[PDB]
């Protein structure tokens, strides 16, 4: 019942086709040097570079409306810091140590899918659990999760297993935000599947 207006309808619609998936997928021209974007955007692979955290942005920045996408991140390919969220065009996408790079600054917001913590302007210590509460605490992030960006309310939230888990972050209005992840695992293959948009004020 905390879902963005329009999300249920957006998710029930026929999914965007492979062309749309590529168009809204990872950007080969906007990722870490240590990442390769494959299949025209459908997934990326992080090369096995030591002492590096590496990010990617989607090709398309969202300034309005409701957008959603599915991230597929194999359970065995997460390593010590696997973070899923969004970033402005200004967020850094590489650093020379293993860390929750996405969410470590003012330009990025991330959920640590290993630890369950939220990062925005955070170096890690003290970061809050999401979703809050006992159900939320025991939640495991399976291979697939949905990322939901509501630019009318200015929220980012997530869904697993058919259930929206609530807004994770507020304070996103008046930005242009891109799908983003940060990864540390050699040879991880992280997929993005765009699920579409509802551009109108109430979606």
């Amino acid at each position: 019942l905390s879902c963005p207006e329009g999300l249920e309808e957006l998710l029930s619609a026929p999914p965007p086709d492979l062309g749309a998936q590529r168009r809204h997928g990872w950007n080969p021209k906007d990722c870490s040097e240590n990442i390769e974007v494959k299949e025209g955007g459908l997934y990326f692979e992080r090369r096995p570079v030591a002492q590096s955290t590496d990010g990617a942005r989607g090709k398309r920045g969202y300034s309005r409306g409701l957008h959603a996408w599915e991230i597929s991140w194999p359970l065995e390919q997460r390593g010590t810091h696997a973070v899923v969220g969004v970033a402005t065009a200004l967020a850094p996408l590489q650093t020379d140590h293993y860390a929750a790079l996405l969410g470590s600054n003012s330009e990025s917001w991330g959920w640590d899918i290993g630890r369950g913590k939220l990062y925005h302007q955070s170096k890690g210590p003290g970061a809050p659990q999401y979703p809050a509460g006992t159900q939320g605490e025991q939640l495991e992030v399976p291979e697939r999760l949905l990322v939901v960006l509501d630019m009318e309310e200015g929220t980012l939230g997530y869904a697993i297993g058919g259930t929206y888990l609530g807004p994770a972050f507020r304070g996103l209005k008046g930005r242009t935000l891109y799908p983003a992840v940060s990864a540390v695992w050699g040879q991880c293959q992280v997929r993005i599947r765009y699920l579409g948009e509802r551009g109108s004020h109430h979606h």
């Binding site: 002492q51 540390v184 040879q187």
Partner: peptide
Amino acid sequence: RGDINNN
């Protein structure tokens, strides 16, 4: 390259 994160 053989480290904790498969590098």
